[PDB]
Design a binder for this molecule. Sequence first.
Ligand SMILES: [Cu+2]
Ligand SMILES: [Cu+2]
Lengths: 658, 658
Amino acid sequence: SAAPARPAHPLDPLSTAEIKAATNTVKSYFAGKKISFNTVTLREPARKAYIQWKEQGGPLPPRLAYYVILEAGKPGVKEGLVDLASLSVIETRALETVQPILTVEDLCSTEEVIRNDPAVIEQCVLSGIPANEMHKVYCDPWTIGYDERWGTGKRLQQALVYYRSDEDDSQYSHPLDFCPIVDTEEKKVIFIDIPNRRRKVSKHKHANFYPKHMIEKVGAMRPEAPPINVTQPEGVSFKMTGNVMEWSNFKFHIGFNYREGIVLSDVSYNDHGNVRPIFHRISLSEMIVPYGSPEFPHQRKHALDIGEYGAGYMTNPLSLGCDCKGVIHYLDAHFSDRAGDPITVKNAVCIHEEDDGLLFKHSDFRDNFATSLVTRATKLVVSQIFTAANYEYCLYWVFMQDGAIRLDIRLTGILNTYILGDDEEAGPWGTRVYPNVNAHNHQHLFSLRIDPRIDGDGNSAAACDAKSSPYPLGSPENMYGNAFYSEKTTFKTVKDSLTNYESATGRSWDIFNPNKVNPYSGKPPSYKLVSTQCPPLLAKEGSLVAKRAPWASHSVNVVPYKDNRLYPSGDHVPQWSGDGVRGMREWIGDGSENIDNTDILFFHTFGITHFPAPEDFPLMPAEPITLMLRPRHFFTENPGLDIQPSYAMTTSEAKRAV
Amino acid sequence: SAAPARPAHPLDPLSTAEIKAATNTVKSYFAGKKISFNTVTLREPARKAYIQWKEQGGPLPPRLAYYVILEAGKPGVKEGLVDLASLSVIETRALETVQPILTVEDLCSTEEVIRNDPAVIEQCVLSGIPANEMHKVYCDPWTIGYDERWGTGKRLQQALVYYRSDEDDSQYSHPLDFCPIVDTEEKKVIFIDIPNRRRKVSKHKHANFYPKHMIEKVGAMRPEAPPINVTQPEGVSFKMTGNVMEWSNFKFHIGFNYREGIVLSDVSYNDHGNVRPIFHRISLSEMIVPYGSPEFPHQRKHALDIGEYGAGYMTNPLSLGCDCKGVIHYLDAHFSDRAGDPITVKNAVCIHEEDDGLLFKHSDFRDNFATSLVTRATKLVVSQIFTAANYEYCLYWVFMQDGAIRLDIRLTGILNTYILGDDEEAGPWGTRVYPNVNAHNHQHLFSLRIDPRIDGDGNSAAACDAKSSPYPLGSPENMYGNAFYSEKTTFKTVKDSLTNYESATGRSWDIFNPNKVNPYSGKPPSYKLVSTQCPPLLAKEGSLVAKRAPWASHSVNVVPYKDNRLYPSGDHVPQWSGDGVRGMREWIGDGSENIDNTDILFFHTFGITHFPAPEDFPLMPAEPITLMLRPRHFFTENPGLDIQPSYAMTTSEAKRAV
Ligand SMILES: [Cu+2]
Ligand SMILES: [Cu+2]
């Protein structure tokens, strides 16, 4: 658009018209050059500018698009900003020594390259696939991640190769032994990693999971179960105005981008007319999935899924009534493809409300529980599912009627697999999940990025450790040895914040406003992070994994806010060695900057360590991960008590029923 | 009675006729004595006798009732066994130095005692309540728990006293400062603990939570939300035959008793015709809720809710339609009252199946996720809710279609509160949640009791710790420093098993059959305990809490099986000092007995540490606790793949749809 209609809300994602305006603007600025588009996305307003606009009648922030382009024959990328109202490029630079995120188009192009490459064909034949069956060879073409033979000097993928006997097979039972290295932009194989011990393609049957396969494998499918139907005959209780949600006193903006997927902003709670801010922004900002086999070339498997592929780019169009059950409001996602044209993923986000059991209950034993009050809970769910080659990550942002917010994740999909010889032991680094199939050990780690405003600006964070009293059993201070308390360590400088979950203290963390006080308890209003799926990073200090994901070696990292501190392994993740002051390493600095009562960013590392078993193959049952942020000392009483009970009978009423 | 009709199944709880036959048998044996009934319950068959009967065409185990009685003018209790087929006492003994669980009748009787006691009246008056308002004074009459002034020589309750301005008030905003001590059997106050600092009754309004109260307090209730309706128009997929459940290949017996509440037995999975045992029995066997204020008499707050009141005794009659939503199968519970007559709690257990989101999913990026399979999960839920004076514990046993079993607990109800002076500081041992109300710190700890038979008899247990390779970064064995593995420590003797959850290793525990092997992975079939809500016991070694709950000081305790090893703080819990070799302390012994490849009992300590906040008051929002037991190396592939997908499109089908 010329200029584009500006959005309803400054945090709305770029419309398809805005995306096209941005790419036309960039094409014109680079006229006479052959360029392609890697990223065209909203450059969100500065936090100050946004808050000022929202709450102080301030300036309208300009509507800006951030782009990343490649140019034929030039190394690295160029990036910059387009001002949409004037259709001009206002910032631009060349970054010749980085590589960018891999788009779906980029994942889709590698198969034709390797199928037609003579050296790859030769390895296929050595592996036992005839030269004329190349259409049966497939690959998951990961970023090379990091290989010290090339650095960032070419843009590279590593084709993890597999074989299908029929196109409807699940290929993951038949990995091949070798790994071609592909120059993404030149479209050619530059190298093939070949193991010292060769293992030829498995001769077993594929391990398949569609109904036609299972009928052959186990005799029959189970009959259809009788349905469980879920209806909202009088509609839903939430209200959307564009991307702005209001539900059970919560209000917030639902955003979305190519990289983070869902981005929740401007989150507040309406406390009987007093609208109290909670978070300025919350999202997942990066991931790392480090594998645990030391043998070459498997050190290159440590995918930073968000930075290297994108939870937006990889997001699934969710299916009419299957992925999301019940009455659903959907949002579409819009990106640019390599030619500069907008592409849409329909039904990328689903939004709906679901039963969530009991909110609270109490009954009196005195009349045999006749005196009783029970109130049911409803939750609001904002969700997407993304597919990073083999993996499926189901992400659910959950708002609850006690004022808590939960992130739930379910891992499913398929294990990454490598070939195993008939006599080869997989342990200790993997598991034989099927004949000739080694599924290597790995971790899934996530970096949750919280930009808080607990009851307003000026916040701090703290570790909370349960501790026995230091006074011994038998002392006047602790006669019976039962005394215990919560030790709160307020983080003063960045260094103080660098903390891990500790089972020995049941560690939680507070994000609080030290400028306010709860009139009952005397404590600051807070949201408490309750999170126990917090694995140590197993890779060693100084390892490639530890270097490329500096955020992952602590459960909690707290840094001063600054604009554009979104991505903790840096802006351009693929093929960075992990050497340099960028991302979280930059933001931590020398550890000395103040983080007490200021504008802060709280980054939480959480996830699981996965030791594969046969139950996970050929397709894996959902594995749950959760964390919760809970109001503590935020309210002066339970915020849900004005919700009509499902059943309520008082002591006097019970006497009147006789 | 009598001889009563035998049950459908040896593990069925005693019917009302069996309870009556038992009490008539005992009344007759003790003819001419004045006795009352504390417990009349099934004495479950020995494990060997049961398995032999079930699987080896063995002897029918005799139908037995375990009883506990008091006799007027005699200290402690008598207990024994009645053989129901012959209406006779076959075992009997006098235990003069123990006290037994408190029943609902026992709770209910105390208020009349303290309201009419001249010394209590006097303290109420000194506290600001006129002598003629005693009908407004209430108490939660806990067991004394343990007080070294009386031991077990009298049966004693401590009346935690509160004031209500109107019968419909929630009394917990108005605790009084003193604690009467009552002889349960003599029905008299024998002492009153009076604090050095007196604190008169609060003059504030009660902190109330029924709708008529909230309308006064916040102006109005929220309007009724539009409904979410759940129906199963073609019925449910599970099938009950008496107490025996079959659902999604699982089969098990649903039992129930006065103490543990729900007991799940004889749990097996049907693996395409091969019916494989998993557990012989699983239940919650004890609890402890230790409070963290060292000031006298608050050391006496550390309720062992299961052993001292009972999760069956205290269980709520459920909804119908409110506590449990949807299509429900209910079981009733039956007990004996003090006169020997059966009592019934209707709808004590609810059984139903609910949607549980996605079971699994995978799509191929190659055709933009057109090639896709999605299967929804159903869970089966077996639940109860019990109320122990102020607390509500909602217990959900959940069976899942990937073969996992979960226990989910939600804590709600009301904080236990003590009085706080106008100028008194509650911290560090509690929180001021309302004016003049101190809610003390406490933990809620639970002992899950698992009697396993993973794929048959002969089991072991182990800790599994994730560990970096011992070889350093840069070595030939760990060049890039990423290698990691699961270290499995098999417990050989009892002492080896005494282990805590460790965040540093993401500790899980395996219960496995070392006599079998998975044909793919080479590992033993196992169920893995995945449990991270595992607080350390904060009370010190040698404390009254640590002594009375020996199980609580480790996350995991594994001991040899023997008959009647149910209750880890002993058979008769109230007023035990914690000195002596009984319960878990007895079963552990000197630590040296074998627990490798034998019949074992695996006791798991889990729960939360609760630092109250005003969000919890006057009624508390549900707080979740969970643990899971997952099949690992049990199956040779994902067990749910024969369940019909909600959506499935193969690659060939996608291409044919154009
Ligand atoms: Cu995994
Ligand atoms: Cu509690």
